[PDB]
């Protein structure tokens, strides 16, 4: 509920389906610890990554496996992945939607931040 | 010199070459008057569209023929074209670079306005 | 239902609320005729522009009044509007979502086309 | 010469000036080894990062310090930075231009790969 990932395909004009997403959180020792992972549905959305209880203050990295996505469609893309890094919940709990728009040599990422 | 157009291809990661661009100026009766046109170069850029003396304040439209570009590469596009509409404002010395990043079902346009 | 407009604000990371949207359709005489209009809700979405019956084959222009949006937030933007022009329903009826991401000197537009 | 970074500001419609950029190369043990760095120029560009002889095939990360850029302009940003990660592949003569278009809650990156 508090963290949602949405992925679109700018070549097909469709949701980007079956995109792997890995979420990390910066530990006290300054390393990235595994936080959550999943894959986008037929709507291009990934719900259920985390809960309000687990999604504490921190620096999060959302790694979107754009390379595996493009290669499964028989295409050779430029990027290894799309990485989104942000501080979460510094002024109290929020809801974060990370949107990504994918092309083989280009991506954009947008954060929609709402107060529940 | 005061108006430049740059077009990139997000699918091939390249300049968008030989893309037709038409510039219109809005006339007093609200119609679009042809003003300038050309084809992007091997660098995806279109220089020499106009001059300081000709590029007066007003509303301009830059139409980029994205549909023809995608058809020439064998790729199915969504838009008829990309239309960028803006007011040229004299407020001190200015150069307008209109940049467009093209995908079959998406484009982005950005104005880089420098002194 | 067949045509939906979604608008985001890249400065605030929020839906772009109260954005005026004018839809035109190219007439037989090659002029733009008024087709539909509305404004984005608190979610940044505009539903109810048209019906499956009215939304026939044609060339449509979706004009998003980005200038009025930015000026209402006391900001002077570059563009007059964001214009999206496309051929609709050439291979039969589809559902079109036109998404726009707005910044004062930049916008992006994405079409998501689905088969109902 | 073979790797160039260009950064634009979507809020002010300008080159993104004095933006710190760090380039890392992935080492055999999967860590990120410092490779190159600099500050974008008055044109939003960072030239001279590396040479043909030094820029071998491998996985590179380009980190753009977007958070510092927005703070210096008095604007509240979302991301800690913009990270662009890619494999450099020799397949014939190539120049990589990494372009980034920055907004407070959004960025776009594009690779322009030319001969
Ligand atoms: Ca878990
Ligand atoms: Ca001028
Ligand atoms: Ca002339
Ligand atoms: Ca009506
Ligand atoms: Ca090289
Ligand atoms: Ca060096």
UniProtKB/Swiss-Prot annotation, chains B, D:
Changing residue 64 to V: In AMYLD1; amyloid polyneuropathy. Changing residue 21 to L: In AMYLD1; amyloid polyneuropathy. Changing residue 88 to G: In AMYLD1; amyloid polyneuropathy. Changing residue 27 to P: In AMYLD1; amyloid polyneuropathy. GO terms for molecular function: hormone activity; hormone binding; identical protein binding; molecular sequestering activity; protein-containing complex binding. Glycans are attached at residue 89. Changing residue 9 to E: In AMYLD1; amyloid polyneuropathy. Keywords: Amyloid, Amyloidosis, Cytoplasm, Disease variant, Gamma-carboxyglutamic acid, Glycoprotein, Hormone, Neuropathy, Phosphoprotein, Secreted, Signal, Sulfation, Thyroid hormone, Transport. Changing residue 15 to S: In AMYLD1; amyloid polyneuropathy. Detected in serum and cerebrospinal fluid (at protein level). Highly expressed in choroid plexus epithelial cells. Detected in retina pigment epithelium and liver. The keyword Cell inner membrane does not apply. Thyroid hormone-binding protein. Probably transports thyroxine from the bloodstream to the brain. It is linked to Amyloidosis, hereditary systemic 1: A form of hereditary systemic amyloidosis, a disorder characterized by amyloid deposition in multiple tissues resulting in a wide clinical spectrum. AMYLD1 is an autosomal dominant form due to transthyretin amyloid deposition. Protein fibrils can form in different tissues leading to amyloid polyneuropathies, amyloidotic cardiomyopathy, carpal tunnel syndrome, systemic senile amyloidosis. The disease includes leptomeningeal amyloidosis that is characterized by primary involvement of the central nervous system. Homotetramer. Dimer of dimers. In the homotetramer, subunits assemble around a central channel that can accommodate two ligand molecules. Interacts with RBP4. Tetramer dissociation and partial unfolding leads to the formation of aggregates and amyloid fibrils. Small molecules that occupy at least one of the thyroid hormone binding sites stabilize the tetramer, and thereby stabilize the native state and protect against misfolding and the formation of amyloid fibrils. This is Transthyretin. The gene is TTR.
């Amino acid at each position: 509920a508090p963290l949602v990932v949405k992925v679109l395909d700018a070549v097909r004009g469709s949701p980007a389906i079956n995109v792997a997403v890995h979420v990390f959180r910066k530990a006290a020792d300054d390393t990235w610890e595994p936080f959550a992972s999943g894959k986008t549905s037929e709507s291009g959305e990934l719900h259920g990554l985390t809960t309000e209880e687990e999604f504490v203050e921190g620096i999060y990295k959302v790694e979107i496996d754009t390379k595996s996505y493009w290669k499964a469609l028989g295409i050779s893309p430029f990027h290894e992945h799309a990485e989104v890094v942000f501080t979460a919940n510094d002024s109290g709990p929020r809801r974060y939607t990370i949107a990504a728009l994918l092309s083989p040599y280009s991506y954009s990422t947008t954060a929609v931040v709402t107060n529940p």
